[PDB]
Design brief:
Number of helices: 13
Number of domains: 2
Strand order of the largest sheet: 1-2-3-5-4
Bound molecules: 1,8-di-hydroxy-4-nitro-xanthen-9-one
CATH architecture of the largest domain: Orthogonal Bundle
Distance between the termini: 40 Å
Helix content: 25-40%
Radius of gyration: 20 Å
Shape: globular
Structural class: alpha+beta
CATH topology of the largest domain: Transferase(Phosphotransferase), domain 1
CATH superfamily of the largest domain: Transferase(Phosphotransferase) domain 1
Largest sheet: 5 strands, antiparallel
Amino acid sequence: SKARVYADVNVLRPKEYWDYEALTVQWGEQDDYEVVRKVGRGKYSEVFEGINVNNNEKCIIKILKPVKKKKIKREIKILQNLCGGPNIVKLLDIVRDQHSKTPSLIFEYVNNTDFKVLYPTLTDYDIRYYIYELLKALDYCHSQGIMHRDVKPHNVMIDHELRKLRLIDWGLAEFYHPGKEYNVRVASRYFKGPELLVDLQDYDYSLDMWSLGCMFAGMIFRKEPFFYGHDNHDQLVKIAKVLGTDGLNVYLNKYRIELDPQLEALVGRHSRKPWLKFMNADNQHLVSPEAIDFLDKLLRYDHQERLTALEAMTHPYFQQVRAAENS
Ligand SMILES: O=c1c2c(O)cccc2oc2c([N+](=O)[O-])ccc(O)c12
């Protein structure tokens, strides 16, 4: 399997663009940034809000708790290559953290409003708008030969007041190379694509489109997460209970994949459950034929059948967003 788009991006670029291991950081000075308070944590990162001592503006300080250095260079190299892209967080500086020998990434400040409180208030139009903004970020990073691999509400910061969106945490992001087999223990459980769950390792940018689909489904149906599995095996079961096993079967057959016996039994057999079956009084104001058509084209077992970020952006669902933009 290989990406249907942007497959040769890293093939055409200098080895220095994607060879993150050869990266040598220009360590800045730690006293240049002052921590003001904690704001959260990734899987292996402590995040704080700070202030640049020199120019007094606000910044974000992400201390990469022991991640592994190979992994630290990867994230830095990717952030450097993506800086300036639409709706992508911007890396301003890189320093050493006193309490530890942990690198510490300084980002431009991003005001975010917790999605758990924000999402319930978004109107039909707001959802179209923000998803389109997120799509701009994905088509951009894909066009630059990079897969984010951890798309989820938690990594999409939105300033609802200024209507600004930023795709964050590129700690699991990677460079796409045709035919390469990647690790499947990426992304967060609820947003893991079928490829990660059946061990199809030569996956590509399309993985992000599945995760986007999961986020989108949770938003329009007001059910988060939309696929609520309790472990990776159960996650595939939850997906199969909605998309049906008929399609799962065609997929496994196409890619010559054999589900282990345990997982195959857990999956069982299920008929497809119509998207409209998920509509109720709480989400009626968000479920429209265009929303469902767009969603349907994202949540496909076959990663090769999913919309690309560029195609997604031209879907009629976003027609008003584009119209408004062309002015
Ligand atoms: O990983 C990040 C992150 C995280 O894991 C958990 C909670 C907040 C975060 O914020 C970030 C911000 N930010 O808030 O501007 C910028 C870049 C990042 O990588 C992160």
